[PDB]
Amino acid sequence: SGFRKMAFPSGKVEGCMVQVTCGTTTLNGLWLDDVVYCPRHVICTSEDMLNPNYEDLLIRKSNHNFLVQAGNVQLRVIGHSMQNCVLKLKVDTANPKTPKYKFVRIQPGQTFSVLACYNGSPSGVYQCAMRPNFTIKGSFLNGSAGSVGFNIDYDCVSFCYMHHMELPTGVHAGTDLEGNFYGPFVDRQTAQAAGTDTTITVNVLAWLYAAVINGDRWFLNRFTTTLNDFNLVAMKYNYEPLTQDHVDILGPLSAQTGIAVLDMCASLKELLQNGMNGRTILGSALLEDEFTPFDVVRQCREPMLQ
Amino acid sequence: SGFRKMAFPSGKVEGCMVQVTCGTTTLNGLWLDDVVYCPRHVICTSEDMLNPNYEDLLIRKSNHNFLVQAGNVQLRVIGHSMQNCVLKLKVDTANPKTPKYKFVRIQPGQTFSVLACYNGSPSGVYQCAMRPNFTIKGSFLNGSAGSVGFNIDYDCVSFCYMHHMELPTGVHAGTDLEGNFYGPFVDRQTAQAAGTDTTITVNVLAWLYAAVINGDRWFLNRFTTTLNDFNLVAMKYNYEPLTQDHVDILGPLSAQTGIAVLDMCASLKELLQNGMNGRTILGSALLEDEFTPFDVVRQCREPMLQ
Ligand code: NA
Structure with a gap:
């Protein structure tokens, strides 16, 4: 007996976490087969994160501007594209530890496990609920963007969240793995108007x-x-x-x-x-x-x- | 920012969990190098979990009587010994996923991550603290014995707890990895009050x-x-x-x-x-x-x- 907040075992996801660096900006990526998924604001300097024109910023980047590190190993980026608020970096080697997976959009009130990561290295695992106002009450510091949320169901990791940002109130916001935000938030330095939350x-x-x-x-x-x-x-x-x-x-x-x-x-x-x-x-x-x-x-x- | 109960990423420990079956009793074991560590009561029938002379019950057991399974792969047992309340099963294959590790004895007030496991398969991870009365307020069902608690420092897993039992009060008791119980508890179906739980x-x-x-x-x-x-x-x-x-x-x-x-x-x-x-x-x-x-x-x- 007993009842404890419990996350899914994180190993299948740990094997997918990589570091993505562009210029002086580092965050995490998710390496599945031959693509690394990460938040698009990796292409920003800290000043660029205030009012970025992501289309223009991405045009000035080439493949070799993306430094992707899987442990001690540099992965070669051979293509890049932006889908909503995520980047897809095609790399020339496929992740041999890719689990069977799918991308899902979770519903408010549902839970998922967050693998908090820094510099491509898993740091901690905890359970979150998607609030009715589409925030999550997590624990994230700078450099945690690209950490992912997931559920594990039989033979399958269902990725549902990629972390992007902290609202000035201290709660957290991010996207699904298609790069679309949960809730009415945007990945730039402007007023972020979270709805009044409610109890599930x-x-x-x-x-x-x-x-x-x-x-x-x-x-x-x-x-x-x-x-x-x-x-x-x-x-x-x-x-x-x-x-x-x-x-x-x-x-x-x-x-x-x-x-x-x-x-x-x-x-x-x-x-x-x-x-x-x-x-x-x-x-x-x-x-x-x-x-x-x-x-x-x-x-x-x-x-x-x- | 934010502050959340967080467990260490469990992947390094997931790669060490195995299933140990003796007769009709199954629990979890920890496979490090060519040794599987598990609770000694795996040698007992559910009814025999009262006044068991483990030394006596163990002498009745042979190597072939221990079925050790790493996923679907059977590990040949080539020796078996008892250290306090743990069995050490020598197997013919070193675990290729063995992490850098240590066995440590934690103090009351200290925290650790529990990888709850059933049938050698990890089910969840949560953070727990060793209560001042040497009990843990965990979430453990029958078949969870042999689940372990640990901390990770850089690349080194410090194993500090192996789960054995639930007191009739619904809190949990176990040993270090040398098989020494934390607290005045015995792996016997006998009365054993815990001390007063105090606040850390x-x-x-x-x-x-x-x-x-x-x-x-x-x-x-x-x-x-x-x-x-x-x-x-x-x-x-x-x-x-x-x-x-x-x-x-x-x-x-x-x-x-x-x-x-x-x-x-x-x-x-x-x-x-x-x-x-x-x-x-x-x-x-x-x-x-x-x-x-x-x-x-x-x-x-x-x-x-x-
Ligand atoms: Na009622």
Whole structure:
């Protein structure tokens, strides 16, 4: 038993991380087969990062202006192109450690593992949720751009995030691997207007189920409510709407614990209306919303099947 | 910026995990050079996990009785021995992915990364701290024994923990890689209370420095305290004593922020006596104690040196 924020094992992704240097600017790249993907602002000086004309900046670069290092080994860039906010650097050797992979665009409320990297070298791994306002609350310093976020599903690494920037509020923003930002952000030094964030209701419910499975039951009440009435409550506390699809997704956790989803919703309603009584749930003194139903079943599942 | 619980990249350890099966008992082993290290209870049936004379049960076992699998590849066992609570299986093939490594014994309050594994296959990675009662608050299911804890320094993996068991209280206990348990625990189905879990004071102070560096400042005050006057308060709340060695370890964080260690002690003293009053620190409504000063330095340092 136990419940901990857990990342996927990072080795398959570590074997893909490289350093990309243009001039005096260094960040990370993702080396898959014969292409290195990286944030386009590697072609900027620090001053260029204020109001870059990326098309013009890229035209002045040639292949040999891109210094790509895979460990101690320099990879030769033989082509370059820009796709949205990422560069694709074709190199003359393919990465023999390329995992089976795909590029996906994740949805707000979903989680992924971040492999934080500096100078092409993996430094740390942690789990992030894509916030409803399309930021992530991560830990990133200068030089971390090009670090990626991913999930691992059977025989496949699904890359969903490439890190680009830190908003002046201290939260983080980036793109999918097609180079399109999550949220209304741009890779330049201008006002970045993140939406007011909200709490991921389906995830809070999943985490309450995790707590029950681990013996933390004090917050259960015998009340139940309707989906519409719960959502009227959720709205008041800046919680996202709970849909029938969410209720369905919580089905396995509901079945395992014997607690109907709308029963647990009534327990969550009482926690929102009356507080947590100075008590903790799974070691937290706040309601936690960065665990998906799948994250919870990964650690807490007890199959009826024997 | 930002501050997140972060694990070390797990790839170097992933390449060392194997499955060890004896009869119908399976768990994980750590394959370094031509030795596989695993918990000795793999030689026991689930029922035999009570009053097991491991020396007796081991003598009944031969090399062929140990099925060691590195993925789908079987490793021929050519010798077997017991060191305290670990089995060492000599295999006929050195692990070609063996990293530079050390076995170390960690102290309470220190952190490490756990690569949770089942059937020799890594499932997740998270950061944990050795509690003052020598337990770990982890996330471990049956079949996770033999999962290891570690830290990485440059290229060297320091293995400090091998998982064995879950106490009936739901916390976790294990050994170093020489098989010596951390704490007064035995790998037997017998009563074994852990000591009182206390709060790692020096780590709480480190985390408050992290908070200040990330702009959380509301808990700073004009109170002063001596070290002993602080310990007289914190001992009443089951906080570990703060020694002058801890004060010295916090020096670099004190210097970066300009907040004397004892002035941050005066802040912590107030938080203990009176709570947060509905406020949070780094997204938590409780005082976090599983980040070491080094953990804080890794993510928040702002070196004077340029
Ligand atoms: Na209820």
